[PDB]
Structures are given as C-alpha cells and as structure tokens.
Assembly symmetry: D3
Homo-oligomer: 216 residues x 6
Amino acid sequence: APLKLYGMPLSPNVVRVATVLNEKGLDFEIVPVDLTTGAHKQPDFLALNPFGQIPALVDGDEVLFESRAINRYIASKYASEGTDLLPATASAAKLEVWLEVESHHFYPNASPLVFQLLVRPLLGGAPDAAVVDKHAEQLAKVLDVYEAHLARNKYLAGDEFTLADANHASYLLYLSKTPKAGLVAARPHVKAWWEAIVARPAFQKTVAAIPLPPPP
Amino acid sequence: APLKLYGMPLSPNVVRVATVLNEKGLDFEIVPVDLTTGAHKQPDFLALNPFGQIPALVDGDEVLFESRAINRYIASKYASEGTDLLPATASAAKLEVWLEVESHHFYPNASPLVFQLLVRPLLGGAPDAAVVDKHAEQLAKVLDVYEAHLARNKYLAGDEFTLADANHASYLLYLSKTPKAGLVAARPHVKAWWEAIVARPAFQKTVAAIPLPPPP
Amino acid sequence: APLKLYGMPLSPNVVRVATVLNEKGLDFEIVPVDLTTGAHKQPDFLALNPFGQIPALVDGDEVLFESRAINRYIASKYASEGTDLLPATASAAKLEVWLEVESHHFYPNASPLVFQLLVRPLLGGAPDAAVVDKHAEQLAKVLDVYEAHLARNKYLAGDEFTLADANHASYLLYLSKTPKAGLVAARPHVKAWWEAIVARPAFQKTVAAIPLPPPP
Amino acid sequence: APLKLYGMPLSPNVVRVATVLNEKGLDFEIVPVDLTTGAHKQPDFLALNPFGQIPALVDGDEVLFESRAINRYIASKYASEGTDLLPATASAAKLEVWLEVESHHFYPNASPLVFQLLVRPLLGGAPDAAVVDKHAEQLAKVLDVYEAHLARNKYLAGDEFTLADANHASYLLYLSKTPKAGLVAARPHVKAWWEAIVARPAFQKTVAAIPLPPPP
Amino acid sequence: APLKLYGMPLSPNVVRVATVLNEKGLDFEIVPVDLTTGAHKQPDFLALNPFGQIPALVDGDEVLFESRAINRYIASKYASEGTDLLPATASAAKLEVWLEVESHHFYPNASPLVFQLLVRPLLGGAPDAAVVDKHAEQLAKVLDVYEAHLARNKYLAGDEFTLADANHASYLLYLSKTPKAGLVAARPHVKAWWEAIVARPAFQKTVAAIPLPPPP
Amino acid sequence: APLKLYGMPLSPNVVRVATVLNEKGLDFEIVPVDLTTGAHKQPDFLALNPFGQIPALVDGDEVLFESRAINRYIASKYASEGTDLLPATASAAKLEVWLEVESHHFYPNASPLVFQLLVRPLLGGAPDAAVVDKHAEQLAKVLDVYEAHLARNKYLAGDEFTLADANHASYLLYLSKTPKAGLVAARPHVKAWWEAIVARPAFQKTVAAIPLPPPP
C-alpha cells in the first residue's frame, strides 16, 4: 500500500529515503509534520519516532525511523520490486563496508557543509568558516579514498549500483549546489560515479519532487 | 506599491520584517528565492544582498537587507501608515537602548535555541545539549533584566508599543513552540508583555501567514 | 580459518568485533598493529584500511574495516555457527532501527564519555567537564528511550538477543567502569537488559580476553 | 552639560562613543568604573547598566548603555552641534543598512581579532590560532563587500561621512595595530576610506585621548 | 639594582611576579609596554620576550619571561633577601608537586574565570556561560583536593609559606572579586589558607599597588 | 631503592619521567595501574594521586605526581647519580625560562597533535582537522622561536644538556612518528638539537623500553 514518509520534502535525509523508494518503484506520499512547532509542548510525533527526528516511515503496521534503517528494511523487504539494491552479485564484504563508510565518513562531513552553506543563509545566518574548513578538508581526505576505490570499481560494491551508492545520492546532490561542489568535480572517478547516479531514471524522479525555490 | 520581501516564509528573520509590514498595514508579497540551491554557482541573489543572506526587501528602486535595517527604514519612511512604531511620545533613550538590547542580548541567545530545538530535528539532527544549555541560561539572565524593566514599563520604551517590541515578536513566537517556552512563561511581566503582543491584530495576521505544518 | 583482527585488545571498538566473533564461536587472533608509530611515515596499515583506523579484519581473501560492517558481514556469512545474531524470528523492522540507533545515538554519546573518563587520565590528562556534561545528558535522554522500549521488549529487536544488542556490549562494559555507570544502573530495564548481556557465556569469554590492568 | 562616559579609556567600545561625542563637539568626561572588582559582590554599576557592561553614558537624567544606542541617541538629540552624523542628504536606505552591517558583520569579526592579538598577550596569553583564522577570513569576505561598495560610494551611506562610518572607526584603529592590519590595507577603497576617517580632526582628538602605552 | 617588570599593573600574571618581588623585599618598577599597539607591526618587545607575552623581567643583564620562571629564578637567586620562599625545612616533594599543581590545575581553571567575569565586561562583552560553567566546576574539583590537603598541612608544602603558596595569590585575589568567589569561601581550609595569605605584609603591599578603579 | 613509576609504558607523560630516571641511571619499575577500569567506582589510585592522573612515582616514603614535579625532584635529589641535569655551569636564567616554555608552549601544542594523529586512530577515530590545524600552526610558531634560540645555543640552557632538554624528549619522539614530524625536520637547529637528544645512550635505553607494536 502507499507508504507514508513523514518529513519535509527539502530535507536531504528525507530525500535519501525517497531515493530508495523510487528505485524500488514503491508508492508513497511525503507527509510534512509539526514536530513541536505547535507549542504547549505535549509530545505527538514522538509516537512515530521517540527520538523526535525526521524522517519516519509507516509501512502498514510497521513504523521505522533512522533513514538508513528505513532504506535497508525497504531494500530487503521489497527485494523484488524495481532495482535490486542488494544484488547477490555485488561483493558482500564491499557492500557492508561502504554502507558504514557513508554513515561514518561521508555523512558526518557532508551534512555540516550543506547546513552551513545552504540552510543557514536561508535562515538569515552567515556560514561558519571554521566549520566549513574543518569539514571540507575532512571530506576531501575521505573523497581521495573514494577516488582510489572508484578507479578500481564501477560502483562502491562492484559492477552494479547498490544500496551503498543510493545512500549517497541526496547529499551529493546538495553538495553540488554549494561552493564546495568542487570536492566532487575535482576527483575524476568520484565525478563520473556521481554523474552516473544522476543519470538514473529513479533519481531523476526523486530530484523532480524536491520543492526547490526559483531563482531571484 | 507592493513591497517584495525575499525569503522563506518560515524563517523567523523574514517573519520579523513581515511583523513590521503588517503593523504599518503596507502591501507586500513574500518571494521565496534560490540562494545557491541551483548549483554551478554563479552569484544571483547576491545582487539584492551581496552578503547573500535573507531577507531582502525591494522598495521600488530601493533594496535593503538586514531585517532590522529594513524594519527601521520602513518604520520611519512610512511613519504615518498604520501604527506609529516610532512614537514621539515614547522615550527616545529607552527606545534606542532596547533596540540594541534585542540585537545584542535577546537575538543571539534566542536564535540558537530555535535552531537547535526546531530546525535541526526537522532536518534529521538531535539538539546539541551544550548549545541549548549555554543559551537557555544566557537568555534566562537576559530575561531577568526584561522582567525587572517590564515590571516598571508597560512596553520596552514606555507606555506604548514601539519598534523595540515588534522586533522581538517572531522570536518570542518560535521560542514558545520549544521546550524552552518556560523562560518566558516563568517571568510574570515578560509573559504578560508577550501575551499583549500576540493579541495585536497585526500580529494575528502575521502568524496567520506562516506556512506551519499540521500535527502528526 | 582463524580470522585476523587487527587492533589493540583494549580498544572498545576492537572488543565490539571480538564480541560478535565469540558469539559465533569463530576462531581468530587479535593482532596489534603499528598505525604510523614507526615514523618516516610511508603508509602501511593503509593497505588493510585506507582510512587508517582500527579495527580491520582479514577473512581469508576478504578485508573489511568499520567494526559494524565487520559484525554484520560475519553475522550473515557465518549465519549458522554459534548464535543466530540475525534470527528470522526477530522483528526485521526493529532489528534495523536499533542497529542504527546504536550507531547514531548511543555510540556518539558513549564513546566521548569513555574517552574523557578512562583514556585521558591514563594519558596524563584531566576529563573535560564540558564534554562529559554534554554527552552524559545526551546519553541520558537516549537511555530514557531505551528504558521505555525495553520495558516492552526483552531485547532491542524482540524476544531474542540479536546483533542489535551485541553491538552495544563493549561500550556498556566500559561505561560501567566510569563514574557515569549510573546512567545505566538508574534505569531498571536498561540495567536488567545489560545484566542479561554480561551473563552471556560468549560475553564472559570476550571480557576475559581484555588485558585490563591490575589495581594500584 | 558635561556628559559622563563610564568605562576604561582603552576599550574600543568606549572609544566608539567618544568618537561620536567629539564629532558633535560635546563636552564629556570618561569615568573608569569598578564593575565587580571590589569583591563581596553586591551589584553597583548594575544601576547604570543592569547588563553590567561598559560603556554607559549619563545624559543629565538619562542613562543609556549599548554603545550604538548611545551613538544614535546623541546623533539625533544633538543633531545640530558639530557634524551632522545623520545628514538628510545621505541615503536613508544605505545609512540604515550599513549601520546594521557594522553591527552584524564587521563588529563580530573585528573584535575577536583585537581581543586575541592585542588583549590576550597583554594579559599573559597567546592568541588562539583557530579564532584568529576563523575571524580573519570572515572579516576578509566582509571587507570584499565593503571594497566593492566603497568603489561606488565615497562613504558607506553616500557622499558624506555619517554615523555609519564613525561607528567603524575605533575598531579600524585597533585592527591597524595588529598583524591583521593587512585586511584593510590590501583593499584599495577600504584603505582610502579608512585613511579619510583618520584624517578627520574629531578623530584626531579621539585618538589623542587613548592612554596607549609607550614602546619597550 | 631596581628590577624592571614589564607589563600592565592590572594583569594578574604581572601581579604574580610583583607578589614574589615584595616578599623578597627587592626593588623594582613596573614598566607598561606597547606590545604591538603601535601598528605598522615591526617587532619591538619581541626582543625581551620572543613569544611576545607579558611579563618580562630584566635583572641587570638577565632577561626572563614566563612569570613562574621569573618567580623561581628570583626565589633562588635572592634566596636570602626577605622571606625564604624556598625553605629547606619545607618538604621538597610537596613543594615541587604543588608548584606544578598550581600551573596545571589551578591556573588553567582560574584564569578563564577571571577573564570571562572581570575582563570581558570591562571590554563591552558578556561572560560566556559555557566557559564559566566548565571552569567553575573543574576548579571546584581541584579545590576539593586542596581542601583535603590543607586540612592536613598549614600551607601547600608544609608548615611554612613557600613559593608554592605565593604563586596562587594574584589569582585567588582576582577570583575573590568575581561571583565565583564562593569556590574558595565554601571550603574551610582553602578559605583559612587564603585569608592567611592576604594577611601577609608583603601581600598587603602588592595589593596596594594594583591601580584598581573606584566604584560607580 | 627501585623507584616505582605508576602508569602505562606507552604514555608519553610516563616516558618523560623514565627519560629522566635513565639519565640519572636510577633503578625503577614501571607499574601499570587500573585507574577506575575496575567499575563500582570506589577510589584506589586516588591514594597516590588524588587528581587521579598518571604518572605517580613512589620514592620510598615519598609519593609525587605531575611528571615535571617528579623530574625536578629526582634531578635535584639524586643530583650526583648519572648526568647532572641541573649543571651549575648552565645559565640559571635560561634553564628556568626554558622549563616553563616547554610546559606552556611546547607541551600544550605537542600533545593534542600526538593525541589526534596517534591515539585516536588506534581507538577507531579519525583525527580532528580543526584541532590538528590549530596546534600544528601554534607549535610551528613556537618552534620558530626554538630555532632562533638554538641557532645561538647548543642546548636550551646553554652548552650542556639539562633538564630543560630532557623534558622535551618523549614528545619530540612521538611527534616524529606523526605526519607532522616535518615541524621539527624543517627547522635546521631544532632538527640537529633533536638528533643530538636521540643519540644519547640514556635516551636509547628509554626508547628501547616503549612496548611499541610491530608493523602490519
């Protein structure tokens, strides 16, 4: 049945889930929610996610939160619909290693950059130079390892596109709209790899759904 | 003519300007803009605001940025339309002092709190306890001074509602939707003063325009 | 064949892997390695782990790094040996959600505490009060959610002990040796749940292997 | 009557007020005060400034604090004496925008630099490299915008020297005595603009009053 | 001959040296110096102290910097004049241990507190709550150890007042003028010990020389 | 009798003491201790060191802690055995100044670097770029002063090797095993000076005792 994805359509963490839902060609609606923005604070969304973070997904009777837990659950549960995000042809050792690398090395460095360079200015604040510098450099070192790996593998886990690559898509997308898009562009294989991901029909759909504002 | 307010309708810094535009009963439209979110980064909004921050207001041939510069400009320029946000009956010494107090004591402590407790969770992140603690405490000390002052003055600058009070409205509003709403509630005069501001017809209009999401 | 676990036997991240290897009853040896501690710096371990972090595991021809990637790989690969860390009887939705909760909520708060209160003093430094306070409080909120969950489930994913619980063991162990052991003790179900984990024979073995120093 | 300016004559925030008092040619004395430096802490200056910060100015029966609130009050109150810091010939849109730019972009970056490079060493401490780097870079970006603006305007608000320029003087002065004086020097119009400000007779007087120590 | 002490008479690090010079009853003058405050930056005091920090002391042909290096040098060099700050009757093990404790535990926590609560407000800034909290708590734990020690020893190194105690005096003095003076007062022996130090004639002289401002 | 040095043989702060014990040719054993790593936390090592930090040294009936207090005590107490770490031929002014420089300028910058680049990766963590950058740069400026000094002096205090040089050895050793070893290598005299220290027989012994792991 139509899956319910709770969250703001602009949040890259919501887009990471939408990414996987389109690949699998599953039906779903993105439901925006008032976390606490209603005042007199008496815990409501806390019923879906007790940690009170977006996104959350309701799968019939199942409720899941943690975008990566959701992506993995959906990828194995609906293993047949759409793309096989967990190919048995992909290396299992590489697939598990790169899922964690994204979680612990790419994400923690990619998000602060998207936050300082995209979100803050939209809210009336100037990017924190110290935060940008620390993370741009850390992400650069991280992307040097992706570069050497991708020079030897078409995708993260091997010849085929898997969950490992899809989990990167929303943040690569947002990174490309910042002045730090060069971290990706300057690395040949990272760049090719990224351009291959954007070319994906499912991804095209996902991007199409982001309520991105119009120029000045 | 209809003023153009560039920015996201959810940003409290945009709401601070809308606050003053409704009091003056001026006509305007809030135009959302793509700051850099279009990639291949080649500076567009930078033409309105070279600092690249929201909001910006176009008044015919005039372009202004810095929400407080905009509010003051509009308050003196359209001095007659709607409320007199700069009454000659208000104390000039108090009016100037409390405009700066808001800028240097209230704002710097109120925004981090709104950011960590409202924005971050909407983006998939958990509030930073250290940031919340530092600022809740600093805002508390700041609000103890407002409390003693407001026990002796109906409004910040005196008997009447002025620009000094209006500049606080959007952030008091957002603060009320967080678990730190108590900083205001626990202080009798701050609370009365705030409740008086919400009662204002102009403010009612402003609140009405915020595209606040629906509950879970 | 005997798996090679590269790392210091005292590092909780190495112990998290050993935890899973004993449950599965697999054979392995923990090999301590010189990361860069040999000077004239010309990258050696970087061949196992290009990120240059411990631990790394060599499974015949396979090399994996990221303790959780290693644990998951071993848990599905050697699915039959020893305990079934991935029971098909466990809820799949809960199992995936709690694997991520540990990674994103428990770990990031548990490690700084172990680092400031255990490691630093061993190296001649005093714990940073600000770091301890921030994380003890964040971990406390996190453990309030575990408490409510564990009041309703024997283990994280349900009736049985799974990978989700095992991934917590080394850090719960180290936390218990700090002045913040109370975060666990003060929560009834968290405490029972933890005491159940220590009772496990496999865990007993693991603890037995940590080269913990003798009292003064 | 002779205005009383409470504060240390070396504090740039006190000098920012003195700057405006000399332009207006008003009479005043700078009174140094014991904030809390008398021990057994029982709040005294707190009567002038409840926030307990310097400077404070007593204008007969009026007490004001917040250096910029003081400068604006004096600039409009004594609108005729000395220089017209608020010319009706100056652009009102530019004047309000640049008053805020100084407050939110220049000041927050200029002060940390003066603090780490001038104050700390005088107190036995070494400058924090991270703080200097973050702010020198942020101030640099800020001064690139001043440069483009000043290439098109003689002064911030237009053809004439206004309050907007005067509010910058004390910090430009202190910045020039640091190793980061180059941020100003390297920008042609910023440099010319600054040199024009120092040439002002009123400013000459102000500088003359700072109790600056003698060389080694 | 009259020793030359370079530095501001208000800086507690200069007062720590003056403390020891008066005990020894040596003659000296405190010379205030322009560190870099002369602009066009071309290194002058750097000749006394290449680190460019205050204080520096010129002893005839000798130049020393690092307040504690100066205090120790003077204490052994002029071992006979005035008080024997290095009594052979004092425990040598205790004397060396408490000289380092002051340097590594007391000083690093006492100075941030004096800086945020005394210096910043004098310069127009509000104390950083996070910095005050972190250090007040760390100093509290440190003073609990002094309390237990001082319950068993009249002074740090034993029965007599030594260099170890004198090195604490200026910072205990400044701490007493802050809202955190209670850290000392609340600990019986620390308090008695401190009151004994203030009673010292030499110390009375030292305090007398600090150019402390008059009340409001 | 055989001195007991409490601590981990890998900790550079323990190695700083061992350094001085070998120079003096004293007998001792390095005893590793459980600080709190035994749980149910009821203070044991706290009897040697109430601050609960390593190392501690028991000299018969004497207990000392603070590595530098220990080094100085042993250097004067066993003044005759082995090397005279406190030569009366060395300049007393230079000797005291450089003991403090190491404590306040070298150590605080050298340790964070050893911690982020050596310790963290051994524990499963990535170096913090911001911390490395801040300290590498601060240490660089510090080493520029050592360079100019060492171009004029064979050793820190003069012609002979003293306690001042020995206190640097363990950290210079660890720094050499990091990617920041260049800070030393790139400075001619610092490099020569360091190479002279490693050549020392006593130092050779010390290095020999560090339980450094074998390559991958």
